[PDB]
Design an enzyme around this catalytic site. Structure first.
Site, PDB file in Angstrom:
ATOM      1  N   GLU A  35       0.858  -1.006   0.005  1.00 47.35           N
ATOM      2  CA  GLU A  35       0.032  -0.061  -0.092  1.00 47.35           C
ATOM      3  C   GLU A  35       0.932   1.271  -0.079  1.00 47.35           C
ATOM      4  O   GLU A  35       0.727   2.140  -0.903  1.00 47.35           O
ATOM      5  CB  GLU A  35      -0.987  -0.057   1.305  1.00 47.35           C
ATOM      6  CG  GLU A  35      -2.204  -0.817   1.192  1.00 47.35           C
ATOM      7  CD  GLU A  35      -3.106  -0.589   0.124  1.00 47.35           C
ATOM      8  OE1 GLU A  35      -3.066   0.521  -0.414  1.00 47.35           O
ATOM      9  OE2 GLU A  35      -4.175  -1.357  -0.010  1.00 47.35           O
ATOM     10  N   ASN A  46      -7.101   9.668  -6.235  1.00 46.17           N
ATOM     11  CA  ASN A  46      -7.649   8.930  -7.086  1.00 46.17           C
ATOM     12  C   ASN A  46      -8.737   9.806  -8.042  1.00 46.17           C
ATOM     13  O   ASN A  46      -8.954  11.182  -7.804  1.00 46.17           O
ATOM     14  CB  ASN A  46      -8.615   8.008  -6.332  1.00 46.17           C
ATOM     15  CG  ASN A  46      -7.928   7.250  -5.275  1.00 46.17           C
ATOM     16  OD1 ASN A  46      -7.156   5.908  -5.720  1.00 46.17           O
ATOM     17  ND2 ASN A  46      -7.932   7.449  -4.137  1.00 46.17           N
ATOM     18  N   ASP A  48     -11.495   9.993  -8.719  1.00 47.31           N
ATOM     19  CA  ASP A  48     -12.821  10.171  -8.168  1.00 47.31           C
ATOM     20  C   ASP A  48     -12.963  11.167  -7.076  1.00 47.31           C
ATOM     21  O   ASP A  48     -13.773  11.722  -6.755  1.00 47.31           O
ATOM     22  CB  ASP A  48     -13.449   9.180  -7.579  1.00 47.31           C
ATOM     23  CG  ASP A  48     -12.802   8.538  -6.397  1.00 47.31           C
ATOM     24  OD1 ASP A  48     -11.713   8.849  -5.922  1.00 47.31           O
ATOM     25  OD2 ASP A  48     -13.345   7.815  -5.577  1.00 47.31           O
ATOM     26  N   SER A  50     -10.976  11.733  -4.506  1.00 48.15           N
ATOM     27  CA  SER A  50     -10.578  11.138  -2.881  1.00 48.15           C
ATOM     28  C   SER A  50      -9.143  11.006  -2.928  1.00 48.15           C
ATOM     29  O   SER A  50      -8.531  10.670  -3.932  1.00 48.15           O
ATOM     30  CB  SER A  50     -11.496   9.949  -2.515  1.00 48.15           C
ATOM     31  OG  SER A  50     -10.990   8.830  -3.065  1.00 48.15           O
ATOM     32  N   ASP A  52      -5.663   8.652  -0.582  1.00 48.81           N
ATOM     33  CA  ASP A  52      -5.314   7.656   0.466  1.00 48.81           C
ATOM     34  C   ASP A  52      -4.087   8.113   1.047  1.00 48.81           C
ATOM     35  O   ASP A  52      -3.212   8.698   0.381  1.00 48.81           O
ATOM     36  CB  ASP A  52      -5.206   6.408  -0.375  1.00 48.81           C
ATOM     37  CG  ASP A  52      -6.336   5.933  -1.092  1.00 48.81           C
ATOM     38  OD1 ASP A  52      -7.089   5.816  -0.243  1.00 48.81           O
ATOM     39  OD2 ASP A  52      -6.579   5.459  -2.308  1.00 48.81           O
ATOM     40  N   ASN A  59      -8.797   5.829   2.893  1.00 45.12           N
ATOM     41  CA  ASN A  59      -9.253   6.882   2.022  1.00 45.12           C
ATOM     42  C   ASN A  59     -10.220   7.773   2.587  1.00 45.12           C
ATOM     43  O   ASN A  59     -10.817   7.709   3.746  1.00 45.12           O
ATOM     44  CB  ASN A  59     -10.154   5.796   1.153  1.00 45.12           C
ATOM     45  CG  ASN A  59     -10.812   6.497  -0.213  1.00 45.12           C
ATOM     46  OD1 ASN A  59     -12.163   6.998   0.066  1.00 45.12           O
ATOM     47  ND2 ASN A  59     -10.043   7.044  -0.825  1.00 45.12           N
TER      48      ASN A  59
END
Lengths: 129, 106
Positions: A35, A46, A48, A50, A52, A59
Protein backbone atom coordinates in the site's frame (compact mmCIF):
# COMPACT_ATOMS: atom_id res chain seq x y z
CA UNK A 1 8.98 8.19 7.97
CA UNK A 2 9.97 5.08 6.03
CA UNK A 3 9.73 2.08 8.36
CA UNK A 4 11.94 -0.98 8.26
CA UNK A 5 10.11 -4.28 7.80
CA UNK A 6 10.89 -5.61 11.29
CA UNK A 7 10.66 -2.14 12.82
CA UNK A 8 7.07 -1.83 11.63
CA UNK A 9 6.10 -5.35 12.70
CA UNK A 10 7.20 -4.44 16.22
CA UNK A 11 5.19 -1.21 16.21
CA UNK A 12 2.10 -2.98 14.86
CA UNK A 13 2.45 -5.75 17.46
CA UNK A 14 2.80 -3.12 20.16
CA UNK A 15 -0.42 -1.51 18.90
CA UNK A 16 -2.26 -4.85 19.10
CA UNK A 17 -2.76 -5.68 15.42
CA UNK A 18 -1.57 -9.28 15.81
CA UNK A 19 -4.67 -11.42 15.21
CA UNK A 20 -6.97 -8.40 15.27
CA UNK A 21 -10.23 -9.58 13.70
CA UNK A 22 -8.39 -12.86 13.13
CA UNK A 23 -5.60 -11.45 10.96
CA UNK A 24 -2.05 -12.48 11.88
CA UNK A 25 0.60 -9.77 12.13
CA UNK A 26 2.08 -10.81 8.78
CA UNK A 27 -1.08 -9.63 7.03
CA UNK A 28 -0.73 -6.10 8.36
CA UNK A 29 2.96 -5.82 7.52
CA UNK A 30 2.36 -7.21 4.03
CA UNK A 31 -0.51 -4.78 3.44
CA UNK A 32 1.62 -1.80 4.44
CA UNK A 33 4.36 -2.96 2.09
CA UNK A 34 2.17 -2.96 -1.01
CA UNK A 35 0.00 0.00 0.00
CA UNK A 36 2.66 2.51 1.08
CA UNK A 37 6.00 0.68 0.83
CA UNK A 38 6.38 1.34 4.57
CA UNK A 39 6.19 5.12 4.05
CA UNK A 40 3.94 6.99 6.49
CA UNK A 41 3.94 10.06 4.23
CA UNK A 42 2.45 8.05 1.37
CA UNK A 43 -0.09 10.14 -0.56
CA UNK A 44 -2.16 9.27 -3.63
CA UNK A 45 -5.08 11.00 -5.34
CA UNK A 46 -7.76 8.99 -7.12
CA UNK A 47 -9.68 10.02 -10.23
CA UNK A 48 -12.86 10.23 -8.15
CA UNK A 49 -11.55 13.13 -6.07
CA UNK A 50 -10.65 11.08 -3.01
CA UNK A 51 -7.16 10.56 -1.60
CA UNK A 52 -5.41 7.76 0.29
CA UNK A 53 -3.05 8.54 3.15
CA UNK A 54 -0.35 6.95 5.25
CA UNK A 55 1.14 3.54 5.95
CA UNK A 56 -2.20 1.86 5.19
CA UNK A 57 -3.58 4.19 2.49
CA UNK A 58 -6.86 5.06 4.23
CA UNK A 59 -9.44 6.73 1.96
CA UNK A 60 -10.84 10.25 2.41
CA UNK A 61 -14.37 9.49 1.19
CA UNK A 62 -15.65 7.64 4.27
CA UNK A 63 -12.85 7.35 6.79
CA UNK A 64 -10.78 10.51 7.28
CA UNK A 65 -11.42 14.21 6.64
CA UNK A 66 -9.09 16.00 4.24
CA UNK A 67 -11.41 18.95 3.60
CA UNK A 68 -11.53 18.47 -0.17
CA UNK A 69 -13.51 15.26 -0.69
CA UNK A 70 -17.24 15.36 -1.51
CA UNK A 71 -19.47 12.91 0.37
CA UNK A 72 -17.08 12.97 3.33
CA UNK A 73 -18.23 10.80 6.26
CA UNK A 74 -15.10 10.87 8.41
CA UNK A 75 -16.09 7.70 10.26
CA UNK A 76 -12.68 7.52 11.94
CA UNK A 77 -13.24 11.10 13.14
CA UNK A 78 -9.69 12.18 12.40
CA UNK A 79 -8.16 14.57 9.87
CA UNK A 80 -6.30 12.75 7.10
CA UNK A 81 -3.12 14.63 8.04
CA UNK A 82 -2.99 12.75 11.35
CA UNK A 83 -2.40 9.62 9.27
CA UNK A 84 0.93 11.00 8.06
CA UNK A 85 2.90 11.21 11.30
CA UNK A 86 5.81 8.89 12.09
CA UNK A 87 3.59 7.76 14.97
CA UNK A 88 1.23 5.13 13.54
CA UNK A 89 -1.34 5.31 16.35
CA UNK A 90 -3.92 7.16 14.21
CA UNK A 91 -3.53 4.82 11.22
CA UNK A 92 -3.77 1.75 13.46
CA UNK A 93 -6.86 3.06 15.25
CA UNK A 94 -8.58 3.86 11.96
CA UNK A 95 -7.59 0.54 10.39
CA UNK A 96 -9.18 -1.24 13.34
CA UNK A 97 -12.49 0.44 12.55
CA UNK A 98 -12.13 -0.32 8.84
CA UNK A 99 -11.26 -3.98 9.37
CA UNK A 100 -14.30 -4.24 11.65
CA UNK A 101 -16.74 -2.86 9.07
CA UNK A 102 -17.87 -6.32 8.01
CA UNK A 103 -15.51 -7.29 5.20
CA UNK A 104 -12.26 -8.01 7.02
CA UNK A 105 -9.11 -6.85 5.24
CA UNK A 106 -10.97 -7.01 1.92
CA UNK A 107 -11.15 -3.24 2.36
CA UNK A 108 -7.52 -3.08 1.19
CA UNK A 109 -7.08 -3.69 -2.55
CA UNK A 110 -3.29 -4.08 -2.32
CA UNK A 111 -3.66 -6.72 0.36
CA UNK A 112 -6.22 -8.54 -1.80
CA UNK A 113 -4.00 -8.53 -4.87
CA UNK A 114 -0.63 -9.21 -3.25
CA UNK A 115 -1.09 -10.63 0.25
CA UNK A 116 -4.37 -12.54 0.57
CA UNK A 117 -3.89 -16.30 0.39
CA UNK A 118 -0.09 -16.20 0.55
CA UNK A 119 2.44 -17.06 3.25
CA UNK A 120 2.07 -13.71 5.01
CA UNK A 121 3.99 -14.81 8.12
CA UNK A 122 7.11 -14.59 5.97
CA UNK A 123 6.91 -10.82 6.50
CA UNK A 124 7.70 -11.07 10.22
CA UNK A 125 9.85 -14.20 10.28
CA UNK A 126 13.25 -13.64 11.89
CA UNK A 127 12.55 -10.26 13.48
CA UNK A 128 12.89 -10.18 17.26
CA UNK A 129 9.25 -9.83 18.31
CA UNK B 1 -33.72 -5.12 -16.23
CA UNK B 2 -32.21 -8.60 -16.81
CA UNK B 3 -33.98 -11.65 -15.36
CA UNK B 4 -32.90 -13.23 -12.06
CA UNK B 5 -30.96 -16.46 -12.66
CA UNK B 6 -30.09 -17.33 -9.06
CA UNK B 7 -31.12 -16.63 -5.49
CA UNK B 8 -28.33 -15.28 -3.28
CA UNK B 9 -28.29 -18.61 -1.43
CA UNK B 10 -27.85 -20.37 -4.79
CA UNK B 11 -24.63 -18.50 -5.53
CA UNK B 12 -21.96 -21.10 -4.77
CA UNK B 13 -18.25 -21.63 -5.57
CA UNK B 14 -19.30 -24.05 -8.35
CA UNK B 15 -20.48 -21.04 -10.33
CA UNK B 16 -16.92 -19.70 -10.52
CA UNK B 17 -16.42 -18.09 -13.92
CA UNK B 18 -20.05 -17.99 -15.00
CA UNK B 19 -22.38 -15.02 -15.38
CA UNK B 20 -25.34 -14.63 -13.03
CA UNK B 21 -28.16 -12.18 -12.39
CA UNK B 22 -29.18 -11.62 -8.76
CA UNK B 23 -32.05 -9.48 -7.49
CA UNK B 24 -32.78 -8.26 -3.97
CA UNK B 25 -32.18 -5.46 -1.49
CA UNK B 26 -28.99 -3.83 -0.24
CA UNK B 27 -28.12 -5.50 3.05
CA UNK B 28 -24.85 -3.63 3.54
CA UNK B 29 -22.63 -0.94 2.03
CA UNK B 30 -18.88 -0.51 2.40
CA UNK B 31 -16.80 2.20 0.78
CA UNK B 32 -13.06 1.75 1.32
CA UNK B 33 -11.80 3.82 -1.60
CA UNK B 34 -10.42 1.72 -4.42
CA UNK B 35 -12.70 -1.06 -3.19
CA UNK B 36 -16.46 -0.83 -2.64
CA UNK B 37 -18.61 -3.69 -1.36
CA UNK B 38 -22.38 -4.02 -1.57
CA UNK B 39 -24.07 -7.04 0.01
CA UNK B 40 -27.31 -8.21 -1.57
CA UNK B 41 -30.05 -10.41 -0.11
CA UNK B 42 -33.41 -11.67 -1.35
CA UNK B 43 -34.52 -13.70 1.65
CA UNK B 44 -34.73 -12.78 5.34
CA UNK B 45 -32.46 -15.05 7.36
CA UNK B 46 -30.65 -16.07 4.20
CA UNK B 47 -27.30 -15.38 2.55
CA UNK B 48 -26.03 -11.94 1.56
CA UNK B 49 -23.79 -12.21 -1.49
CA UNK B 50 -20.92 -9.69 -1.61
CA UNK B 51 -20.81 -7.64 -4.81
CA UNK B 52 -17.39 -6.15 -5.55
CA UNK B 53 -16.39 -2.88 -7.20
CA UNK B 54 -12.62 -2.65 -7.62
CA UNK B 55 -10.95 0.25 -9.44
CA UNK B 56 -8.96 -1.00 -12.41
CA UNK B 57 -11.14 -4.08 -12.76
CA UNK B 58 -14.74 -2.88 -12.46
CA UNK B 59 -16.25 -0.64 -15.18
CA UNK B 60 -15.91 2.94 -13.95
CA UNK B 61 -19.54 3.89 -14.58
CA UNK B 62 -20.67 1.39 -11.94
CA UNK B 63 -18.92 3.48 -9.29
CA UNK B 64 -21.49 6.21 -9.97
CA UNK B 65 -24.40 3.81 -9.52
CA UNK B 66 -22.83 2.69 -6.24
CA UNK B 67 -22.74 6.33 -5.13
CA UNK B 68 -26.53 6.49 -5.50
CA UNK B 69 -26.99 3.33 -3.44
CA UNK B 70 -28.55 3.20 0.02
CA UNK B 71 -29.34 0.35 2.39
CA UNK B 72 -32.69 -1.34 1.64
CA UNK B 73 -32.63 -0.27 -2.02
CA UNK B 74 -33.91 -2.90 -4.46
CA UNK B 75 -31.33 -3.76 -7.12
CA UNK B 76 -30.73 -6.09 -10.04
CA UNK B 77 -27.13 -7.11 -10.68
CA UNK B 78 -25.48 -9.01 -13.53
CA UNK B 79 -21.93 -10.19 -12.95
CA UNK B 80 -19.30 -12.92 -12.88
CA UNK B 81 -18.95 -15.24 -9.90
CA UNK B 82 -15.54 -15.79 -8.33
CA UNK B 83 -14.84 -18.47 -5.73
CA UNK B 84 -12.98 -17.81 -2.49
CA UNK B 85 -12.08 -19.59 0.74
CA UNK B 86 -14.79 -19.38 3.41
CA UNK B 87 -13.67 -17.40 6.45
CA UNK B 88 -15.13 -15.28 9.23
CA UNK B 89 -15.17 -12.51 6.63
CA UNK B 90 -15.60 -14.44 3.38
CA UNK B 91 -18.77 -16.16 2.17
CA UNK B 92 -16.77 -18.27 -0.26
CA UNK B 93 -18.12 -16.40 -3.28
CA UNK B 94 -17.90 -12.94 -4.82
CA UNK B 95 -19.70 -11.24 -7.68
CA UNK B 96 -17.91 -8.85 -10.01
CA UNK B 97 -20.73 -6.85 -11.68
CA UNK B 98 -21.02 -5.58 -15.23
CA UNK B 99 -24.44 -4.02 -14.64
CA UNK B 100 -26.13 -2.54 -11.57
CA UNK B 101 -29.78 -1.56 -11.86
CA UNK B 102 -31.68 0.34 -9.17
CA UNK B 103 -35.33 -0.74 -9.23
CA UNK B 104 -36.36 1.16 -6.13
CA UNK B 105 -34.98 3.57 -3.55
CA UNK B 106 -35.74 2.78 0.10
Amino acid sequence: KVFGRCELAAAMKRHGLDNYRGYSLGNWVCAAKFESNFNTQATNRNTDGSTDYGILQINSRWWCNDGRTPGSRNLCNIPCSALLSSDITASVNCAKKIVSDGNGMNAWVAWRNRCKGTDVQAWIRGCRL
Amino acid sequence: SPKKTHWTAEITPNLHGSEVVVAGWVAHLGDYGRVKIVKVSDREGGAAVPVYLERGKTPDHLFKVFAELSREDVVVIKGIVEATTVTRWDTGVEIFPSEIWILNKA
